[PDB]
Amino acid sequence: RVLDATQLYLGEIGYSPLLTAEEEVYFARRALRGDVASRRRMIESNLRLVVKIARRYGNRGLALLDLIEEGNLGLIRAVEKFDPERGFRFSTYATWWIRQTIERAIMNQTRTIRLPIHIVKELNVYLRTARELSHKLDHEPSAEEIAEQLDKPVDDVSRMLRLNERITSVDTPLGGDSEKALLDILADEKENGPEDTTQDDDMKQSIVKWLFELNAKQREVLARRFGLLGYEAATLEDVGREIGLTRERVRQIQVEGLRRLREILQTQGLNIEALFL
Amino acid sequence: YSYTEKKRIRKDFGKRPQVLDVPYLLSIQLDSFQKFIEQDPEGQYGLEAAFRSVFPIQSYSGNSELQYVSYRLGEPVFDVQECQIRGVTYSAPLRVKLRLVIYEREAPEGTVKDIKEQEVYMGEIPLMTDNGTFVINGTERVIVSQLHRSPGVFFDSDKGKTHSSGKVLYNARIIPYRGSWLDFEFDPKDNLFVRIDRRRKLPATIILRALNYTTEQILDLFFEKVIFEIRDNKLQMELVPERLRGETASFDIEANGKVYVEKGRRITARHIRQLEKDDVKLIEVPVEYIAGKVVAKDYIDESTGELICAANMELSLDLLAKLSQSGHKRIETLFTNDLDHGPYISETLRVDPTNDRLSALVEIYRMMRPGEPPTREAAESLFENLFFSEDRYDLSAVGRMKFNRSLLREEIEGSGILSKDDIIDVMKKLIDIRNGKGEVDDIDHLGNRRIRSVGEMAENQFRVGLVRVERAVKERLSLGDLDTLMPQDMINAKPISAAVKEFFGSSQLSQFMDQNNPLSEITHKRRISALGPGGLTRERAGFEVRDVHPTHYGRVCPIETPEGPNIGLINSLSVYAQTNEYGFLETPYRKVTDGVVTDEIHYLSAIEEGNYVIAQANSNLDEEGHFVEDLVTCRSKGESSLFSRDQVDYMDVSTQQVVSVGASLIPFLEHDDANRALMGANMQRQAVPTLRADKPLVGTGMERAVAVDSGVTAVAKRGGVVQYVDASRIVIKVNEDEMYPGEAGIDIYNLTKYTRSNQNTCINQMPCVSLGEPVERGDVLADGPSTDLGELALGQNMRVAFMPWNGYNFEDSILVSERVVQEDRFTTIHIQELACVSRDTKLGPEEITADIPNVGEAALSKLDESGIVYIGAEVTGGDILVGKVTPKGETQLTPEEKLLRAIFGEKASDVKDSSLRVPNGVSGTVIDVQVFTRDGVEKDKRALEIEEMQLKQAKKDLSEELQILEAGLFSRIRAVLVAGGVEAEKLDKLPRDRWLELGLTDEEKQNQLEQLAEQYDELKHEFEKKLEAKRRKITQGDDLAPGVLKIVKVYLAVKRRIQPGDKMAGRHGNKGVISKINPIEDMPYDENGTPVDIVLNPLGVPSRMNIGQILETHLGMAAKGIGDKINAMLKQQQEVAKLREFIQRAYDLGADVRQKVDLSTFSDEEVMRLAENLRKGMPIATPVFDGAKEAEIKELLKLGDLPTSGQIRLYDGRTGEQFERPVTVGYMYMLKLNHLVDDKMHARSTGSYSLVTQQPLGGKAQFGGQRFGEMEVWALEAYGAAYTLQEMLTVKSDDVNGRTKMYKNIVDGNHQMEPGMPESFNVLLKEIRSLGINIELEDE
Amino acid sequence: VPLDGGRFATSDLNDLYRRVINRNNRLKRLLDLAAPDIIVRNEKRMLQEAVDALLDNGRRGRAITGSNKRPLKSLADMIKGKQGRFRQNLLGKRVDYSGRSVITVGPYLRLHQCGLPKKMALELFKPFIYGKLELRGLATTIKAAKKMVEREEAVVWDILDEVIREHPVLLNRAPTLHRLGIQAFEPVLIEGKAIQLHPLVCAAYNADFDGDQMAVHVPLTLEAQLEARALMMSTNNILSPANGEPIIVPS
Amino acid sequence: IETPITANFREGLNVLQYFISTHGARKGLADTALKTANSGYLTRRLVDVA
DNA sequence: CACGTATGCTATAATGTGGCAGTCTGACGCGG
DNA sequence: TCCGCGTCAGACTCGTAGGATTATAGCATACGTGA
Ligand SMILES: Nc1ncnc2c1ncn2[C@@H]1O[C@H](COP(=O)(O)OP(=O)(O)OP(=O)(O)O)[C@@H](O)[C@H]1O
């Protein structure tokens, strides 16, 4: 029989009212006053009109089935707010809604990285300005050439052209040969390999030895300040909370701990060796 | 002979004089794209076709319409020079004139209401170079010609769909250029079916009903008629004697007076002539005979008016008696025969569930659009739209041509749509083949495989641009206001531009030109593929396609194709092969007129080759006459045998037409197995050009042809004397005869100097001519990177010796002397391009300054203040080429770093580091640096110093242009002035600016002075705008990607030397890795002392069966022997007469040498410049199959005072004692393949990690570990080695705990197993849970 | 995740997920409106199309094609066949302490020996240099040992040379047919980017010196050093397991 | 072919003798690439059960 | 209040969809 | 049970190179969090 979701729905609309001028008014007048059945009909009837409106709004964001569904929601909001008393027809008023609801729902579900309407709205005018220029310049317009025709900022144009880039999927094959995708190449940022993991472990274990090689009162105000042994990274003035309670003596003893430690790095074989790093 | 030829002549062992000279090898690419841009007035081709096809476009209402007028190409925005550098398409503006015409609605057709007309841009088309390349984003790229099934009709049969029945089911299929497919096919019960688009299977009479055909007409078309007369009482029947042929007499066959055949007897040819000569027309028959026969037309009772029996119904005794008494004693029935005229349509109609025309269009509609309720128009519109509308369907010219000649038709040229006739004619020949007459076509014949070059494909992709515009035009026209809306507001320029760049980029045929060798460029442009879109696939590819087909002869090369799964599909074009005007291939052939082999040549199509018998080029001509022998070995009908003289109709022109370019360069190919010949020609393309171009001593002659036609060299447009020689450029003065009278006549050739290749190798053009040398028109002025005096120079020749050496030449392993390495002769050049990008991050913009945090003064030593390394500065891995810094944001300075930055200090600025530094391992010399900046942010001071040079160098370069152009322009006027008013010095007193002031008498030459005077001014005014274009494009800010602010591109220059691991080979597929560079002390050497260069393994020869290399060696030695004799006489400083006698004795030796070069014609000076180039070795040409034989080579060896054998007395260098017995020594022209070991070796301990799999990455490109696949795994399972595997599953790969933990344990010394469980499995758990499946790890 | 080029990249699952959530939320909206059933039907058919496309795209009907006219990779696809997790990212793995290079002949070597380039074994045995360095007291920490190696100073070659002695390395050639497709040897450091292999075991690999490459692997654990010397050593592997016949035979 | 190749590699092949040699050469090397997957797939099949 | 993001409304009549795929092959089940 | 239509497989490592197009109107009223 028929097993395409497309042709099935398109069949069910093909057996639904095709209303006259005075018919539309009869149903619509009852639809506003809530006849229930009336709101169902006007909608059922004009599903055929939504499809012909979604025949031109395809290949832009979603599929044909997706456009129709959204387009139907526009016909419904048109039915929620139609004026039968007015001598003007319905098919005219409903078209304004069905063209709007489609464009708007395409603006959201077209791009992966969600873009609000405001940054998008503006982008359109920048792009539609590029059309005019391109045809007469016969050269795809620059960020400047667009800025000189609108007389608007340079970074704005460039800032609006930075949110119109495409996104290559991670699982996309590479060079007319699905040998490897981008995931088999693209690196992991977070975790650096053992060599970088053991760097910090060995460097920070060497410091634990250098802190036990200094004076007891020299490694008590030096680490408790930087937050090496203590719990919170304090300042020269804040070391007074512990037992130091000093401002001058804290600053002299902090630097006295660092001066004896600078000679511990000159003798072990670092100093200028570990200065590049 | 010419001057550039006089410098060095190649001894040709050809004996088959070239009647056809090798054509320009790059014919297809250039001629194809020429058609595409060519604005043909009527005969639409390329763009002109694309517009007339789609246009005129009219609105959906049909009140407004857009009409195509004319188009044009503007000159390129950026020329090739610039395009290659900047990095954007070398394209031309497309300006097309459109006309918007609108009609009156209530009025008939008010065509003259508003005829709006304007010109509109849409898309920029990449142009083709003179090399047949497209510059896409600064890359010369090549579009390979495609090979696809030619449209029209084709008859096939699956030799056993159901081997159950094992019945050969025959089928036909109409293949259009555009449109739906139309197939006809039989079935186990021989019922004809039709399957449009191979969709549903529908009875084949349903399509005929759709063409308005009643049951009667159908039968009347296919089947013949059998007449039955019921006279008085005796039933009678018309007999054509030729009908009851090969059948059995089921009844007693008797006539006006005679019984011919008895019941149950076979009617032979005797009985048929017995009846036919007796002139038998009528025979009385029994009524039992009709029971089974099918009635033809309808038969209504004259009386009642009802159908007694409908058409196509098997008769019976009672039906016949009902018809005899109705009043019909003239009955028509079908001529059914199970053997010849088969009853198929008849049995098919019994299956056919349709009725009339309108009902036949229903099931056709219910097939393709199932579910939609059918109307009169929807059913009719569909079927009419399929194969019967000017829109949907198009067979094309080739389609209709092949379609017609497949049906043995009347027309070559006809309609693009299928007519009723066409369909039934196709069903008819399908049924002919089913009967017995007619043979099926096969796809492998090149008569069915059409070639589609770029220009036709560029046309196709340009149509989709127009088709995608058609949509936007119609919809905007109808609902949009008529007046206000302009035609360019409805046009979009992006869909065309995007659809064309889709082709020039993403397509499988658009690929980066392989230009690591002149041979690679020319053979890669002459590549022809069956793959990509509208072709075949490795997944889909069979065998018989790949297999060499006897049509390939002269058209396609049998030995030119990758040995990769894309083996038989990809193929190079033959040497003298060319495209048929329609699409097929064609090969040159010498016509034989009345026995006389005439010099008139005819390019025979793939179709007509089969017709005539074709003699081979091995056949001997009688010096203007005919074949010397009465019997001639020839070939035809795709087979080979001997024939008589008068029977020969055509003959192979040359002996090299079977092979390609790749194969025409292999000498003694005749003595080489096709398997090794293929590999040899495949590796010859991979031959990286060497430092010093060395000519091949053992060539074929095709050498020069390749080097010249490749477009890598610079050949003279006009002959004359080289006024000026230079490393950068060449200036040549033209002779009077060739020089035009208008212009000055001084050609300019700015030679391409050292710059990059697509394979990262050297590209140079050195002048091969001396200052002030007389040069003939079409002579090579500058040599390329792999060319020498115009001849191709791919690799280098050297003294080789075939013998084992302590296993250093084990399996084809190579033992090369240090002396080769000392001459740096196989040392190669590699220009590597690296870039530094200043981006715009979220935090802020990046810049390029010398100010870099965490750095040594040692690193910023080679940089300047701007932050770019000096030109000529040596660099090594770790040194920084270009200083870059990016913004540093909220950065958590770890306590241990805040303390370390507080101790030693250097509170690094809020600006991150990412300077471009030489990649770890590379080291070269910077030869140039180029800076690209957006039109905006102020520049680096170095970027200003480079602008200084470009400008002041361009001001000089243009000053030099107008200066020398002035001198050549007044040089003419000076000669014109003497003719008439003859005065020498008195005219040359005052300066030359007041020479246009002087004139002549009323004469042609007075008009000439006015031409040169106002052309001097034309150049004087032209010089300013030439300066403007240069100045602006230097001041112009180069457009970049969004986010990028400026870029700095560096060019390094690496000199890699040969070393163990480097791969080299001959041209006979003899491969090998260099194992050891032997000391000069250790190299074997002859009694005389000179050592050997390479020592090859003799065992890489018998098994290989590529004896061509040995012949290359022997001839090379002989050739060198002659050079060694000439070298000695030139060193001894002997005489011109002595060299003349010996060299004349050398050129003339072969049996019938093709070239007969007399040296009495050569002047003394011309002989000594020749001998000076002959001393390295007399270059020899061995045509592919007409090469030199033993008799000639051994005779040459006697001239060189070399051994007849070719084996020399060798002595071991290590020791000094002789080897036990002689070894073959000679000069083999070997090559240095691109597969160099510096570009291969890799190592990894720990590095990057994958993104989700959390195993290491892949390749030395990204620094990745080698893959240990499942096969590699089972090996350790077999050993039993359990940890070695678990170690390679966890700590070496995923196990995040393991890898870091194990590292720390190794540095501790404790190499301890510490597993956990790879990440990639923990992924697989959640991935199956995401699929809605409870997969948990059940514990102990 | 974002590219270095300011671009982003997303897996096709995210895209397939947005098709499911959008249609599911639109159904919530239409059930709020009490819309006619004919529309609710389409929405439910759509929802199922999206769900089925998320689990296994190419199965029920046409697989939902995306940007480059290719089909979106679904869930099932990452568990399915070669390109699935099992065969590609679980039984087969890229491995650390691994390098490959053009091999060349080693006619001077004994059976239990193989040429290994210096700069190869350098990078391969990186954690073993840092380890032996802290022992001698030449490196105080590991980033100190890192720089010692980087500068390629003379005395670092002699330490690298120390650890490698009495240390086997695995040599693999593709394809790995039988177990002998990997054999272990005692590395001999050689100046040059070429690996030097023993002629007699060339038969097992089917390794022709016509431009072959062999993967190297370092056995880290002491058990792996014992396994390599005991089972996978070239001297302990003579006869083929297929036939009781010597595969180590001159040619 | 009814008529085989008379000559050898020392004597040299004529133009067809080579064209004839091609037919056998390319099909022999086609089965080196394509037929290998059935035999390597057998190795896979055997292993899993064993 | 404001900047960024969202929801909203407009009225001639208009009311059933539709660019490629190229066919691969030998094997083994699963509804009519 | 035969026909037919569907689903499932189809060697292992290495390489090269990056990557693409489109289009959703002007305007005002509105809802949400920091100052
Ligand atoms: N596609 C491929 N996959 C795997 N191995 C291949 C492939 N193509 C070629 N080879 C291998 O490359 C080698 C090419 O032939 P090779 O020169 O090694 O022959 P051989 O076995 O040494 O015999 P001979 O001594 O007669 O030349 C073979 O070992 C072959 O298995």
- Cis before B56? omega within 30: yes
B10 occurs within a structural domain: no
Work out if B163's Cβ lies within 7 angstroms of strand F: no
Together in a domain, A13 and A83: yes
Name the nucleotide nearest A103; use CA and C1'. Answer: F24
Work out if A123's Cβ lies within 7 angstroms of strand F: yes
- Cis before C175? omega within 30: yes
Secondary structure E strands in B695-745:
698-699, 714-715, 720-725, 729-734
Q: How many helices (H) and strands (E) does chain C have?
A: 9, 7
Nearest to B787, CA basis, from B715, B860, B719: B715
How many other C-beta atoms lie within 10 A of the C-beta of residue B1124?
18
Please judge whether C94 and B1293 are an interchain contact, meaning their C-beta atoms are less than 8 angstroms apart. yes
Instruction: Tokens 């390495």: give the residue.
Output: B821
Q: How far are the Cα atoms of B462, B510, B722 from residue B38, in angstroms, in the given order?
A: 14, 22, 36
Give the CATH number for residue B755: 2.40.50.100
How far is it, in rounded angstroms, from Cα B1267 to Cα B1186?
50
User: B779 lies in which domain range?
Assistant: 712-786
Together in a domain, A184 and A230: no
Ligand 1 atom, smallest distance to B1104 CA: 27
Together in a domain, B669 and B809: yes
User: Do B208 and B349 form a contact (C-beta atoms < 8 A)?
Assistant: no
**DSSP string computed for B519-560:** HHHHHHHTEEE--STTS--TTT--STTTS--TT-TTTB-TT-
Q: How far are the Cα atoms of A176, B196, B461 from residue B533, in angstroms, in the given order?
A: 11, 22, 12
B1249 occurs within a structural domain: no
Residues in chain D, overall count: 50
Pocket test for ligand 1, best of C105, C178, C206, C247 (most atoms within 8 A of CB): C206
B1245 occurs within a structural domain: no
Together in a domain, A143 and A157: yes
User: Do B1151 and B12 form a contact (C-beta atoms < 8 A)?
Assistant: no
Q: How far are the Cα atoms of B261, B263, B268, B273, B1058 from residue B247, in angstroms, in the given order?
A: 11, 12, 9, 15, 82
How many other C-beta atoms lie within 10 A of the C-beta of residue A124?
11
User: Do B261 and B274 form a contact (C-beta atoms < 8 A)?
Assistant: no
Residues paired with B451 in a beta bridge = B147
**Is B942 strand, coil or helix?**
helix
How far is it, in rounded angstroms, from Cα B927 to Cα B875?
11
Residue where a domain terminates, one of A127, A160, A191: A191
Together in a domain, A258 and A183: no
Could you identify the residue whose CA is nearest to the C1' atom of nucleotide E9? A97
Residue where a domain terminates, one of A136, A162, A191: A191
Q: How far are the Cα atoms of B591, B1290, D15 from residue B619, in angstroms, in the given order?
A: 14, 71, 11
Instruction: For ligand 1, say whether the CB of C213 is within 6 Å of any of its atoms.
Output: no
B16 occurs within a structural domain: no
Backbone angles phi, psi at B220, to 5 degrees: -65, -30
CA distance A135 to chain B (A): 5
Instruction: For ligand 1, say whether the CB of C206 is within 6 Å of any of its atoms.
Output: yes
Closest alpha carbon within chain B to C170 = B1284
User: Do A165 and B840 form a contact (C-beta atoms < 8 A)?
Assistant: no
Together in a domain, B1143 and B1098: yes
| Angle value at C-alpha B726, between B720 and B732, nearest 5 degrees | 15
How far is it, in rounded angstroms, from Cα B452 to Cα B746?
40
Together in a domain, B476 and B425: no
For B1271, the closest of C93, C125, C175 (CB atoms) is C175
User: Do B458 and B423 form a contact (C-beta atoms < 8 A)?
Assistant: no
Residues paired with B236 in a beta bridge = B229, B284
B812 occurs within a structural domain: yes
Pairing of strands B814-817, B1074-1078: parallel
Work out if C80's Cβ lies within 7 angstroms of strand F: yes
How far is it, in rounded angstroms, from Cα D46 to Cα D50?
6
**DSSP string computed for B88-131:** S--EEEEEEEEEEEE--SSSS---SS--EEEEEEEEEEEPB-SS
Together in a domain, B798 and B844: no
For D26, the closest of B546, B616, B617 (CB atoms) is B546
Together in a domain, A38 and A128: no
CA B405 to chain centre: 29
Pairing of strands B145-149, B527-529: parallel
How far is it, in rounded angstroms, from Cα B53 to Cα B464?
11
Residue having the nearest C-alpha atom to atom 4 of ligand 1:
C175
How many other C-beta atoms lie within 10 A of the C-beta of residue B930?
16
Give the CATH number for residue B586: 2.30.150.10
How far is it, in rounded angstroms, from Cα B113 to Cα B102?
6
Instruction: For ligand 1, say whether the CB of C161 is within 6 Å of any of its atoms.
Output: no
**Is B482 strand, coil or helix?**
coil
How many other C-beta atoms lie within 10 A of the C-beta of residue B477?
24
After which residues does a break in chain D occur, C–N more than 2.5 Å?
Answer: none
Together in a domain, A3 and A109: yes
Q: Which residues are CB-contacts of B785 (< 8 A; sequence separation ≥ 6)? A: B518, B689, B693, B712, B761, B762, B763, B764, B765
User: Do B1233 and B1064 form a contact (C-beta atoms < 8 A)?
Assistant: yes
How far is it, in rounded angstroms, from Cα B1283 to Cα A149?
70
Could you tell me the two tokens for B970?
Answer: 């007044």
**Is C126 strand, coil or helix?**
coil
Could you tell me the two tokens for B478?
Answer: 């109808």
**Is B1328 strand, coil or helix?**
helix
How far is it, in rounded angstroms, from Cα C42 to Cα A44?
13
How many other C-beta atoms lie within 10 A of the C-beta of residue B1136?
14
Nearest to C95, CA basis, from A204, B142, B1293: B1293
| Angle value at C-alpha B1115, between B1109 and B1120, nearest 5 degrees | 120
After which residues does a break in chain C occur, C–N more than 2.5 Å?
Answer: none
**Is B826 strand, coil or helix?**
coil
Q: Which residues are CB-contacts of B733 (< 8 A; sequence separation ≥ 6)? A: B720, B721, B722, B723, B745, B746, B968
Q: Would the annotation count C161 as a binding residue?
A: no
Nearest to A193, CA basis, from C126, C237, C184: C126
Q: For B330-339, b where at least 16 C-beta lie within 10 A, e where not — what string?
A: ebbbbbbbee
Task: Report how many domains make up chain A.
Answer: 3
How far is it, in rounded angstroms, from Cα B37 to Cα B93?
12
**DSSP string computed for A57-112:** S-SSSS-HHHHHHHHHHHHHHHHHT--SSSSS-HHHHHHHHHHHHHHHHHHHHS-S
User: Do B771 and B722 form a contact (C-beta atoms < 8 A)?
Assistant: yes
Residue A207 C-beta-side C-alpha neighbours within 13 Å? 19
Q: How far are the Cα atoms of A165, B699, B1178, C227 from residue B10, in angstroms, in the given order?
A: 59, 9, 7, 64
Together in a domain, B290 and B411: no
Instruction: For ligand 1, say whether the CB of B303 is within 6 Å of any of its atoms.
Output: no
Could you tell me the two tokens for C156?
Answer: 């670092």
Q: Which residues are CB-contacts of C157 (< 8 A; sequence separation ≥ 6)? A: C118
Q: How far are the Cα atoms of B1319, C80, C85 from residue C73, in angstroms, in the given order?
A: 21, 11, 13
Element (H, E) at A205: helix A194-211
| Angle value at C-alpha B472, between B471 and B478, nearest 5 degrees | 95
Together in a domain, A104 and A142: no
Together in a domain, B496 and B383: no
How far is it, in rounded angstroms, from Cα B294 to Cα B214?
16
User: A263 lies in which domain range?
Assistant: 192-277
B739 occurs within a structural domain: yes
Instruction: Tokens 């009386």: give the residue.
Output: B303
Together in a domain, A240 and A151: no
Together in a domain, B1132 and B1196: yes
For the beta sheet containing B1180-1181, the strands, ordered from the edge strand earlier in sequence to the opposite edge, are: B11-12, B1180-1181, B698-699
Together in a domain, A122 and A155: yes
Element (H, E) at B594: none
User: Do B706 and B792 form a contact (C-beta atoms < 8 A)?
Assistant: yes
Could you tell me the two tokens for C201?
Answer: 């075991």
User: Do B603 and B21 form a contact (C-beta atoms < 8 A)?
Assistant: no
Together in a domain, B952 and B1022: yes
Experimental method: X-ray
Chains within contact range of chain B (3+ C-beta pairs < 8 Å): A, C, D
Residue where a domain terminates, one of B288, B310, B341: B341
Closest alpha carbon within chain C to B1100 = C210
Please judge whether D9 and B616 are an interchain contact, meaning their C-beta atoms are less than 8 angstroms apart. no
Could you tell me the two tokens for B639?
Answer: 């087979």
- Which chain A residues in 80-109 sit with Cβ < 7 A of strand E? 81-83, 86, 88-93, 95-97, 100, 104
**Is A162 strand, coil or helix?**
coil
How far is it, in rounded angstroms, from Cα C7 to Cα B132?
34
| Angle value at C-alpha A169, between A167 and A171, nearest 5 degrees | 165
Nearest to B423, CA basis, from B477, B387, B384: B387
Work out if A112's Cβ lies within 7 angstroms of strand F: no
Name the nucleotide nearest C177; use CA and C1'. Answer: F12
Could you tell me the two tokens for B532?
Answer: 């990509």
Q: Which residues are CB-contacts of C37 (< 8 A; sequence separation ≥ 6)? A: none
Task: Report how many domains make up chain B.
Answer: 9
Q: How far are the Cα atoms of B812, B1212, B1325 from residue B1226, in angstroms, in the given order?
A: 18, 17, 67
Together in a domain, A141 and A205: no
How many other C-beta atoms lie within 10 A of the C-beta of residue B261?
19
Could you tell me the two tokens for B492?
Answer: 């979009």
- Tell me the residue type at C176: T
How far is it, in rounded angstroms, from Cα B779 to Cα B721?
12
How many other C-beta atoms lie within 10 A of the C-beta of residue B700?
29
Together in a domain, B378 and B286: no
How far is it, in rounded angstroms, from Cα B882 to Cα B866?
9
B1335 occurs within a structural domain: yes
User: Do C112 and C168 form a contact (C-beta atoms < 8 A)?
Assistant: no
How far is it, in rounded angstroms, from Cα B315 to Cα B294?
6
Residue having the nearest C-alpha atom to atom 20 of ligand 1:
C208
- Tell me the residue type at B1001: T
**Is B847 strand, coil or helix?**
strand
Together in a domain, B199 and B331: no
User: Do A187 and B1257 form a contact (C-beta atoms < 8 A)?
Assistant: yes
How far is it, in rounded angstroms, from Cα A224 to Cα C241?
67
How far is it, in rounded angstroms, from Cα B1245 to Cα B1223?
47
How far is it, in rounded angstroms, from Cα C185 to Cα B1175?
51
Chain E positions under 7 Å from a protein CB?
4-7, 9-25
User: Do B621 and B635 form a contact (C-beta atoms < 8 A)?
Assistant: no
Together in a domain, A161 and A215: no
Closest alpha carbon within chain A to C29 = A73
Residue where a domain terminates, one of B624, B654, B684: B654
Give 3-state DSSP helix, strand, coil % of chain D, rounded to 5.
65, 0, 35
Together in a domain, B1220 and B1269: no
Counted across chains A and C, CB pairs separated by less than 8 A come out at 116
Residues paired with C225 in a beta bridge = none
Q: How far are the Cα atoms of B809, B1081, B1082, B1212 from residue B1215, in angstroms, in the given order?
A: 19, 9, 8, 6
Together in a domain, A187 and A206: no
Instruction: Tokens 């092969």: give the residue.
Output: B577
Report chain D's terminal Cα–Cα distance, integer Å: 46
Distance in Å, CA B544 to ligand 1 centroid: 24
CA B496 to chain centre: 25
Closest alpha carbon within chain B to A157 = B1042
- Tell me the residue type at B1055: K
Report chain C's terminal Cα–Cα distance, integer Å: 55
Residue where a domain terminates, one of B341, B371, B399: B341
Together in a domain, B1009 and B1158: no
Q: Would the annotation count C210 as a binding residue?
A: yes
Looking at B1184-1313, list the stretches that DSSP marks H as alpha helix, in order from N- to C-terminal side.
1190-1199, 1270-1279, 1282-1289, 1296-1308
B19 occurs within a structural domain: no
Instruction: Tokens 């002919």: give the residue.
Output: B432
Which of the 8 DSSP states describes residue B994? G
For the beta sheet containing B746-750, the strands, ordered from the edge strand earlier in sequence to the opposite edge, are: B746-750, B729-734, B720-725, B774-775
Instruction: Tokens 């080759």: give the residue.
Output: B609
Name the region of A123 (left: φ>0; alpha: ψ -120 to 50; beta: rest). alpha
Residue where a domain terminates, one of A94, A114, A134: A114
Could you tell me the two tokens for B162?
Answer: 């159901």
Instruction: For ligand 1, say whether the CB of B1160 is within 6 Å of any of its atoms.
Output: no
How far is it, in rounded angstroms, from Cα B810 to Cα B833?
38
